[PDB]
Design a protein around this ligand. Structure first.
Ligand SMILES: Nc1ncnc2c1ncn2[C@@H]1O[C@H](COP(=O)(O)OP(=O)(O)OP(=O)(O)O)[C@@H](O)[C@H]1O
Ligand SMILES: Nc1ncnc2c1ncn2[C@@H]1O[C@H](COP(=O)(O)OP(=O)(O)OP(=O)(O)O)[C@@H](O)[C@H]1O
Ligand SMILES: Nc1ncnc2c1ncn2[C@@H]1O[C@H](COP(=O)(O)OP(=O)(O)OP(=O)(O)O)[C@@H](O)[C@H]1O
Ligand SMILES: Nc1ncnc2c1ncn2[C@@H]1O[C@H](COP(=O)(O)OP(=O)(O)OP(=O)(O)O)[C@@H](O)[C@H]1O
Ligand SMILES: Nc1ncnc2c1ncn2[C@@H]1O[C@H](COP(=O)(O)OP(=O)(O)O)[C@@H](O)[C@H]1O
Ligand SMILES: [Mg+2]
Ligand SMILES: [Mg+2]
Ligand SMILES: [Mg+2]
Ligand SMILES: [Mg+2]
Ligand SMILES: [Mg+2]
Lengths: 105, 385, 52, 426, 237, 253, 148, 244
């Protein structure tokens, strides 16, 4: 309730560049690694429409990396998260793509 | 002879005359056209062609068009033709498609599943009331709840009460909780769907709410219906560790089970019978008033009530005049009604090894000893003297 | 307002006006605005006289 | 065997005729309608079949491409040397058009993409991107835009047909009922009062209390009264098997609500799909929370949501994550508690008006005799008061039948009271 | 220790008291009827299990003084904790004010013990309910009280406690008259015996009767006397 | 282990063969039969063998859902099994509590194959009613009777509990001769002395001493199994059996 | 142990028939990873001088559906022709999985393979070939239908 | 918070009942069998060890027979550690009543004292029960031989013959069919070996798994003599009764 989402909505109107709205459970996808296809394309798109701002709402649907127990795990969440990090790395663009991240955990 | 004769006389003239009336009317239909009736048959075949390709109705678009999913993968914006109705098509229904230009030409299909048959029973129990050895009043509280509003809805509207829903049959093991459920299941002759509570936890995670909701869908169609849930205790006590969703998952199955039991549905008449062994283990919301109106209790039989259990079970048996039925009750104290049924069987079994049809007093005492050793009694009563 | 968030503070604005709406007033009054703080808050079972 | 034998032959003879009537009827010729509109409909389908309005393969738009001024013709383009202002006199022998205004990128369902042109029953303004479209199976070309989303089928069969359970039956004329109206019935019915003010009305209700206070009662009551779309989803139904399918259920729910004018989505019982987020090292709470977080983002948007009022109804507001309960997604918590003596009296009268009661019934004496009871227990009281009339062979109730009722329902089922455990959360 | 084991319920109760009441029902059954000049507490005694002694196995009714008898139903283990205090308080009465106890007073003290364990930190309350009976000294009005786990006591003209106490008390509404007690002591034995053979059954080998007459006469009947009253009643009926 | 053959014969083989004696007596139709003892006692072997003699289908249920693609799940396997059994009737459903495959399934429930047992057993009572009598008996095989749960050990649920000891020296000699009826020997080999040498504890192990002896006939390039081949067998198989018991190591990695 | 399992049936079939013992058919190699399972089989691939095929478990999964089973039939047929033959499936872990969801296509295709290999392993019986040797560094993940 | 980790061992269930006393009795059904028969000329006490091994010294063991005082010995069945404490309490209390009244303590007094001690723990303190079951063999002039069983609930009941420990249902049924009122210690010696023979889980019952003691008035000068038989006399009396 402190208007982190408000401040992004503002920022959209002010910079007048391409603002890629994103909600973190939308990204997770039940077909194998098509959740990952969504990461790479959205960021590929951000190279084109540069300069850019990607606004991600939530970040607990790309969860966390701590699972190692034999019984289940969910390694669908981990893979789409580790794809997120490879776009922030140096071989990709990052100097014309800013990522605005907002979470309440 | 004449009883047969009055029926013969009514039935022949009325039916054969009607048969004659159809024969003339096909012809007369033909006349304003030149052959209407015998041509409607040739048209139906022609329109549909051969083959008819099955699809699954994906969504229905209101304009007499539909999006059908052939399982071969191309989707199609088809038209809806003759020999079908659009409230006989519901999403999910199978459709019969014209091969050359795809059109919904019908569905005369049975559309029955083996998934529903699992829910259903095929039945003629051996269980009838008065195989209940005593506790007569309890029968005429269960029968007042399950069986009686099908016989007369008249009493309940005359009084102006809503007929009681739901029974919980609880007590100790061997007090014949399953034996009542089946005795009333025989009499009512309403579609008696049976489901054991343990099948409601699966080996997948999230399949729970899905399975539970499918029970009540079948139950709802075949109204009036009984849904018997045998030992709904098992799901709270035993976690099988086959479910990947864990303790969390089992709790969620509970919650859909609450809405399907009463809720917002306004489904058909569904009496629910819930056998359980402990009612202090089931979730309190699950058992709460106005969705379970009546709660019957059974406790252990009496000295006289055990006599009733014994007559009904020793009656099938061949017997001697040396058998003192009465001394098998006095020796046996604080033992179930389940123990008396196992005691007749065990006597007969010793008698089948000796290779004779008689059941003697000695095979009864021999049997009485062996069934009493196997029961290991309660530690509930070890507080007390 | 003490430990309200800016979403809670937006909530008090709307709530105030609803209470006016019932009274049938054409403006929101100062009396009604405070009344709306108390309605946004969960505690609105108020006194029972074990606070006197 | 003469008396019975002769006549038995005749009975069989009668079975033969009953069969012949049957074999004649279904082949010359079974009805589906009245008889007459099933004949004409066969001649009507002949008319549709000659036309190519079917078969039209359902496909989908992936990207609107511009076919004039983009150098679709590359006769002067070599990298970026093309004009991008003409494909009509670029290097053409004509001045007039040589391509279409709009190309589009279709993806088929079997998987094969085609670049298609522009229909004649359609304009570029009716073609949206992501929109499902009929293409012609003779030569793929967009013909008709067709309602998007093939996904509704378990969000399309949970839209209600209106059950009639009265607003009256909901106990008393309480503040609790009137609080529903401020959110639901009133801004839709007469938006005129709110318009003068310029106050945009609340939207979130949380009905919370212990089992049997009539939360569900209230749900059904505003289904029939409101007369706007009522989509009730049981919230246990949001859980699915494959992770990101579960979020898809509620995601499509909001696409659906938003499309329709004036909705109320009634989320029933979100003890499932509402667990507070924690890290545990077994697997995480990932499947439950995937669905919950989809929901949260569409209860405030990153853009304004449409007219969608949302009713949460729960038995425990304590399994719920902190994010849902703050206002702006649940503007008003509306508190439901066990009634008092007058309260309990009204509900008894509301049950009892359909019952045969003598004038000697003083409900004041038997409400007093029932304490710390749900309106759902008081129902069981009324049902069991008649059950003792049915057992005694009486047809008109007595004060005596209600005393018997109160003792058995209240004393007996107090051991089994939901009130005690569930109050700890409420 | 100091943690609460008795705590307030969101209803209006304490769950440990309701629970303790459930505990009295799962026990054996003791009956109370007073005559014009007798108390009679009779109790159901087990014999499902056999080879059980009769001389050395404690009885259900334990004489506190020479004129105050106590019977108990519920947990047979707990029982002895309430009685050990009750006997010592009687000797303290003799010490500090003189005169032996009055039945009303001992009942009020016993009530105060169970009362306290419903509200003191680190105890559960007793799952045991008493019929405390007897005579006042230098008087001969029969006194019959019954105290229960709440810590509340009631005087009763006739009462019954333990398993199926509702079934037995129904019987006693219909045969014992408040206005005219059984005319003699012997008529009063036939009433307690008449009541017991409903629930207890299974011979006169389970029925125990303690009869008190005024002036410090405690007698506990022999198996032979019991048989005799059961037989008469069976036959007449 | 002949006594045990005769006990299972009464409860399983006899009622399928002739319902008429059971009518005469009026005895309440047989049900579940629990077989229990250490491994290799041949509890499984006797079930198949009864199924052969009675001439009934032997339906093996692994407590795996894999082999089925026609149920594919345990949440309808119960009732779908009873459609197939009724077609191919008479049947004896065989269901084994393995308790080392389905390791974590057992914990807190007494067996996830006793989930299977109970669910199928509840069906069975109505099966005596569907159109007269039972055609499905069920045989349950368990390692222990203490890993069994109390609700299937109660009377009026079952009708027989057969116990199997491991072999005695006399019993051993017989079990050993069966495996020997299929391979070579040489005169002068006393089956009695090999029973003494063998301490054993499975009839499984006994069959391993015969195969292992046949393998040393290959090693030395003999043409028949000699007595010395038994001395090499017994030692090697024993060293192998006891190592894994006392080191508490399995075949699972 | 492994020479008597694989090599010995081929060079001296006559001895097994004589003594009257069941020859070892399929070979399973379990043990933790890094013990030299594959390397011990390397040795017999040089040494026997028979045919020796080569094959992985991911040769039998494919993009097109039911084109996994068509390979299963191919490797057996080839082995039979140039018999006696050793087939080695390097890691057979993904074929011999013990669990199926049995609603996804990915899983249904492995179901078909697993029945197809198993059926024709019985077809491969009473041949001059020694049956499939297969290894897995795991062993709690395998279906017991192979292991009977 | 401390309250967070409290068991609450000692509230009732909804049944009216004490989970932890019920469970205590559950675990004594695992423990070693002990049977006591009161003859009319003695009490024979015999208990079968729950464990056995051949390296185990079993020749001077007396881990089931414990003497409380000169005239009262008990057989133990349960949590032996818990029992060792209350045996040593009992011994303190028995000696105490003799110190202050100069009179042999009655069987009734010592048995009731021990019961109330168990009773204190299920009543209050927030502690686990003492899971012990005693069979008391004891002599007093007043009531002759007296026989008694106590449970973890802290309740005592008289017996003439009784069996606690493993296989209670089985042992109890057997005693009843045989028991007569006219039996001396010889008949009792035979029955005690014999019931133990029927509940046994060994292929044959042997002396090294039997502990055995009697209390006879047939010892000289009309005195009670406590005898805990040595394992070599037990083996002897085992040849007499023809068990082996
Ligand atoms: N009161 C009774 N009168 C007559 N027969 C009875 C009675 N109680 C038990 N039986 C007999 O014992 C059988 C077994 O009991 P049943 O399976 O009906 O019990 P239950 O109380 O549901 O037990 P559980 O929950 O342990 O399965 C019945 O089929 C019937 O033959
Ligand atoms: N500082 C502020 N000034 C103005 N309005 C505010 C302020 N903070 C919040 N609001 C209002 O409260 C509304 C709701 O808060 P919003 O959902 O934007 O919060 P957040 O802390 O980004 O949340 P979450 O993590 O739960 O998605 C905003 O849409 C905005 O209208
Ligand atoms: N306030 C009331 N007045 C009259 N009837 C009542 C009242 N509340 C509940 N009822 C009766 O009780 C029934 C069951 O309660 P209902 O399902 O409406 O409630 P809830 O509080 O949402 O319960 P849960 O979530 O535990 O299912 C209603 O269908 C109605 O018959
Ligand atoms: N006994 C040995 N002598 C020499 N080298 C060995 C020996 N055992 C193993 N190694 C070495 O270890 C290497 C790895 O072994 P190999 O690949 O055969 O293993 P594995 O246990 O079958 O495991 P994975 O499933 O990981 O392939 C060999 O290539 C070899 O260099
Ligand atoms: N009693 C026996 N006599 C002879 N062969 C036996 C005996 N018991 C077991 N076997 C052999 O051992 C094999 C494995 O035993 P099986 O029946 O599967 O066992 P269990 O269920 O006892 O583990 C049998 O198939 C059979 O060849
Ligand atoms: Mg049952
Ligand atoms: Mg509800
Ligand atoms: Mg959010
Ligand atoms: Mg087994
Ligand atoms: Mg590998």
């Amino acid at each position: 309730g402190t208007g982190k989402t408000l401040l992004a909505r503002a920022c959209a109107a002010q910079t007048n560049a391409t603002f890629l709205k994103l909600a973190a459970p939308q990204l997770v996808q039940m077909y194998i690694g098509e959740g990952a296809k969504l990461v790479r394309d959205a960021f590929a798109l951000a190279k084109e429409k540069a300069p850019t701002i990607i606004f991600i709402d939530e970040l607990d649907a790309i969860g966390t990396k701590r699972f190692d127990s034999e019984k289940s795990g969910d390694r669908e969440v981990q893979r789409t998260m580790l794809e997120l990090l490879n776009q922030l790395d140096g071989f990709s663009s990052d100097d014309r793509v800013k990522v605005l991240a907002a979470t309440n955990r | 002879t004449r009883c047969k004769l009055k029926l013969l006389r009514m039935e022949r003239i009325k039916d054969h005359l009607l048969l004659e009336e159809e024969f003339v009317s096909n012809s007369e239909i033909l006349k304003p056209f030149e052959k209407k009736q015998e041509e409607e048959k040739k048209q139906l075949e022609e329109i549909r062609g051969n083959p008819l390709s099955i699809g699954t109705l994906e969504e229905i678009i209101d304009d007499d068009h539909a999006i059908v999913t052939s399982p071969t993968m191309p989707d199609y914006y088809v038209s809806i033709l003759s020999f079908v109705d659009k409230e006989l098509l519901e999403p999910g229904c199978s459709v019969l498609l014209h091969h050359k230009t795809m059109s919904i030409v019908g569905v005369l299909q049975d559309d029955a599943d083996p998934m529903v048959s699992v829910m259903k029973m095929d039945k003629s129990p051996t269980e009838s009331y008065s195989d209940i050895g005593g506790l007569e009043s309890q029968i005429q509280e269960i029968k007042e709840s399950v069986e009686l509003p099908l016989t007369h809805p008249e009493l309940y509207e005359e009084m102006g009460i809503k007929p009681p829903k739901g029974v919980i049959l609880y007590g100790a093991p061997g007090t014949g909780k399953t034996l009542l459920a089946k005795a009333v299941a025989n009499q009512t002759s309403a579609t008696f769907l049976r489901i054991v509570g343990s099948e409601l936890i699966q080996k997948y995670l999230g399949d729970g709410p899905r399975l539970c909701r499918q029970i009540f869908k079948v139950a709802g169609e075949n109204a009036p219906s009984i849904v018997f849930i045998d030992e709904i205790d098992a799901i709270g006590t035993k976690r099988y560790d086959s479910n990947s969703g864990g303790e969390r998952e089992i709790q969620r199955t509970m919650l859909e089970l609450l809405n399907q039991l009463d809720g917002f549905d306004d489904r058909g008449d569904v009496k629910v019978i819930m056998a359980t062994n402990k009612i202090e283990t089931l979730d309190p919301a699950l058992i709460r008033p106005g969705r379970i109106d009546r709660k019957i209790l059974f406790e252990n039989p009496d000295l006289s009530t055990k006599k009733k259990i014994l007559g009904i079970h020793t009656s099938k048996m061949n017997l001697s005049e040396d058998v003192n039925l009465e001394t098998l009750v006095t020796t046996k104290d604080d033992l179930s009604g389940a123990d008396i049924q196992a005691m007749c069987t065990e006597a007969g079994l010793l008698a089948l090894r000796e290779r004779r049809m008689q059941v003697t007093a000695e095979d009864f005492k021999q049997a009485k000893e062996r069934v009493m050793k196997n029961k290991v009694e309660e530690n509930l009563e070890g507080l007390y003297l | 307002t003490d430990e309200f968030n800016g979403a809670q503070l937006k909530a008090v604005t709307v709530e105030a006006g609803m209470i006016a709406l019932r009274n049938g007033q054409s403006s929101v009054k100062h009396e009604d605005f405070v009344e709306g703080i108390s309605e946004v808050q969960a505690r609105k079972s108020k006194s029972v006289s074990f606070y006197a | 065997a003469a008396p019975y034998a002769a006549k038995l032959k005749q009975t069989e003879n009668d079975l033969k005729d009953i069969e012949a009537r049957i074999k004649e009827k279904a082949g010359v010729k079974e009805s589906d309608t009245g008889l007459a509109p099933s004949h004409l409909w066969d001649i009507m389908g002949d008319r549709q079949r000659l036309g190519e309005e079917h078969p039209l393969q359902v496909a989908r738009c992936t990207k609107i491409i511009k076919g004039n001024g983009e150098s679709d013709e590359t006769t002067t383009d070599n990298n970026n040397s093309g004009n991008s202002n003409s494909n009509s006199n670029q290097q053409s022998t004509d001045a007039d058009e040589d391509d279409e205004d709009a190309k589009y990128v279709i993806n088929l369902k079997q998987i094969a993409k085609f670049v298609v042109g522009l229909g004649e029953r359609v304009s570029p303004t009716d073609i949206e991107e992501g929109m499902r479209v009929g293409v012609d199976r003779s030569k793929y070309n967009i013909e008709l835009p067709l309602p998007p989303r093939i996904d509704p089928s378990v969000t399309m069969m949970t839209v209600e047909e209106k059950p009639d359970v009265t607003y009256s039956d909901v106990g008393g004329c309480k503040d609790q009922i009137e609080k529903l109206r401020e959110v639901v019935e009133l801004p839709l019915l007469s938006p005129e009062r709110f318009a003068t003010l310029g106050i945009d009305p609340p939207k979130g209700i949380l009905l919370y209390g212990p089992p049997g206070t009539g939360k569900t009662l209230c749900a059904r009551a505003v289904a029939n009264r409101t007369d706007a779309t009522f989509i009730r989803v049981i919230g246990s139904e949001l859980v699915q098997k494959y992770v990101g399918e579960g979020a898809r259920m509620v995601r499509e729910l909001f696409e659906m609500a938003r499309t329709k004018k004036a909705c109320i989505i009634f989320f029933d019982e979100i003890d499932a799909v509402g667990g507070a987020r924690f890290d545990d090292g077994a697997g995480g709470d990932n499947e439950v929370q995937r669905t919950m977080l989809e929901l949260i983002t569409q209860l405030d948007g990153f853009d304004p949501r449409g007219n969608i009022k949302v009713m949460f109804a729960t038995n425990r507001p304590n399994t719920l994550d902190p994010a849902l309960l703050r206002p702006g997604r649940i503007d008003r918590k509306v508190e439901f508690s066990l009634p008092d003596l007058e309260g309990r009296a009204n509900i008894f009268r509301i049950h009892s008006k359909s019952m045969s009661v003598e004038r000697g019934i003083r409900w004041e004496l038997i409400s007093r005799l029932c304490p710390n009871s749900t309106g759902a227990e008081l129902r069981s009281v009324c049902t069991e008061a008649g059950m003792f009339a049915i057992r005694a062979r009486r047809k008109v109730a007595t004060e005596k039948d209600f005393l018997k009722a109160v003792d058995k329902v209240i004393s007996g089922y107090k051991k089994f009271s939901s009130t005690s455990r569930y109050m700890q959360y409420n | 220790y100091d943690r609460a084991l008795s705590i307030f319920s969101p209803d209006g109760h304490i769950f440990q008291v309701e629970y303790a009441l459930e505990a009295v029902k799962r026990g054996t059954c003791a009956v109370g009827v007073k005559g014009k000049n007798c108390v009679v507490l009779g109790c159901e005694r087990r014999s499902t299990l056999k080879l059980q002694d009769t001389r050395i196995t404690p009885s259900k009714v334990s004489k506190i003084d020479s004129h105050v008898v106590l019977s108990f139903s519920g947990l047979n283990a707990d029982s002895r904790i309430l009685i050990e205090k009750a006997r010592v308080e009687a000797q303290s009465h003799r010490l500090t004010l003189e005169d032996p106890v009055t039945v009303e007073y001992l009942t009020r003290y016993v009530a105060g013990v169970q009362q306290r364990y419903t509200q003191s930190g680190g105890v559960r309350p007793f799952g045991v309910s008493t019929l405390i009976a007897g005579f006042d000294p230098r008087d001969d009005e029969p006194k019959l009280y019954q105290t229960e786990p709440s810590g509340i006591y009631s005087s009763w003209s006739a009462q019954t406690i333990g398993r199926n106490s509702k079934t037995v008390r129904e019987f006693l509404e219909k045969n014992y008259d408040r206005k005219e007690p059984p005319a003699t002591v012997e008529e009063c034995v036939k009433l307690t015996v008449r009541s017991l053979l409903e629930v207890v059954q299974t011979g006169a080998k389970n029925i125990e009767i303690t009869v008190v007459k005024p002036d410090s006469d405690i007698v506990a009947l022999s198996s032979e006397e019991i048989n005799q009253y059961v037989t008469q009643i069976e036959q007449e009926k | 282990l002949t006594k045990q053959i005769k006990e299972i014969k009464e409860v399983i083989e006899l009622p399928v063969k002739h319902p008429e004696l059971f009518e005469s007596l009026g005895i309440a139709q047989p049900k579940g039969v629990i077989l229990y003892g250490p491994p290799g006692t041949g509890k499984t072997l006797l079930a198949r063998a009864v199924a052969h003699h009675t001439d009934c289908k032997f339906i093996r249920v692994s407590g795996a859902e894999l082999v089925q693609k026609y149920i594919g799940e345990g949440s309808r396997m119960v009732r779908e099994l009873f459609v197939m059994a009724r077609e191919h009737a008479p049947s004896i459903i065989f269901m084994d509590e393995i308790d080392s495959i389905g390791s974590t399934r057992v914990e807190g429930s007494g067996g996830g194959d006793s989930e299977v047992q109970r669910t199928m057993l509840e069906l069975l009572n109505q099966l005596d009613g569907f159109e007269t009598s039972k055609n499905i008996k069920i045989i349950m095989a368990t390692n222990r009777l203490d890993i069994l749960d109390p609700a299937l050990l109660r009377p009026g649920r079952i009708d027989r509990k057969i116990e199997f000891p491991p072999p005695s020296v006399a019993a051993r000699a017989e079990i050993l001769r069966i495996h020997s009826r299929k391979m070579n020997l040489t005169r002068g080999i006393n089956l009695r002395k090999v029973a003494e040498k063998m301490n054993g504890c499975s009839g499984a192990d006994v069959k391993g001493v015969c195969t292992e002896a046949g393998m040393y006939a290959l090693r030395e390039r003999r043409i028949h199994v000699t007595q010395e081949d038994f001395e090499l067998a017994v030692g090697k198989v024993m060293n192998k059996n006891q190592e894994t018991a006392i080191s508490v190591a399995k075949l699972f990695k | 142990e492994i020479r008597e399992a694989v090599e010995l049936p081929l060079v001296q079939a006559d001895l097994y028939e004589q003594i009257g013992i069941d020859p070892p058919r399929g070979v399973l190699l379990y043990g933790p990873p890094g013990t030299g399972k594959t390397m011990l089989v390397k040795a017999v691939a040089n040494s026997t001088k028979a045919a020796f095929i080569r094959v992985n478990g991911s040769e039998f999964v494919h993009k097109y559906l039911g084109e996994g089973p068509r390979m299963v039939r191919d490797v057996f047929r080839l082995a039979r022709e140039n018999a006696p033959s050793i087939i080695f499936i390097d890691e057979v872990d993904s074929i011999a999985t013990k669990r199926f969801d049995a609603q996804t296509g990915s899983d249904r295709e492995v179901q078909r393979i697993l029945i197809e290999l198993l059926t024709q392993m019985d077809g491969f019986d009473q041949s001059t070939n020694v049956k499939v040797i297969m290894a897995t560094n795991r062993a709690d993940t395998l279906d017991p239908a192979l292991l009977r | 918070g401390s309250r967070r980790y409290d068991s609450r061992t000692t509230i009732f269930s909804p049944e009216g009942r004490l989970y932890q006393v019920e469970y205590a009795l559950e675990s004594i059904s695992h423990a070693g069998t002990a049977i006591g028969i009161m003859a009319s000329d003695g009490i024979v006490l015999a208990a079968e060890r729950k464990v056995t091994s051949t390296l185990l010294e079993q020749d001077t063991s007396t881990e089931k027979l414990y003497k409380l005082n000169d005239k009262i010995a008990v057989a133990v069945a349960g949590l032996t550690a818990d029992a060792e404490i209350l045996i040593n309490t009992a011994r303190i209390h028995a000696q105490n009543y003799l110190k202050t009244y100069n009179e042999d303590i009655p069987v009734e007094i010592l048995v009731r004292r021990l019961s109330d001690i168990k009773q204190g723990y299920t009543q209050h303190g927030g502690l686990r029960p003492f899971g012990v079951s005693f069979i008391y063999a004891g002599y007093d002039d007043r009531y002759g031989y007296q026989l008694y069983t106590s449970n973890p609930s802290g309740n005592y009941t008289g017996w003439k013959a009784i069996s606690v420990g493993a296989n209670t249902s089985a042992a109890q049924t057997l005693l009843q069919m045989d028991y007569k009122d006219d039996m001396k210690v010889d008949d009792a010696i035979e029955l005690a070996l014999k019931t133990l023979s029927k509940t046994t889980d060994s292929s044959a019952l042997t002396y090294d798994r039997l502990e055995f003691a009697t209390i006879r008035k047939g010892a000289n000068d009309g005195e009670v003599y406590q005898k805990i038989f040595k394992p070599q006399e037990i083996k002897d009396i085992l040849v007499k009764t023809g068990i082996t």
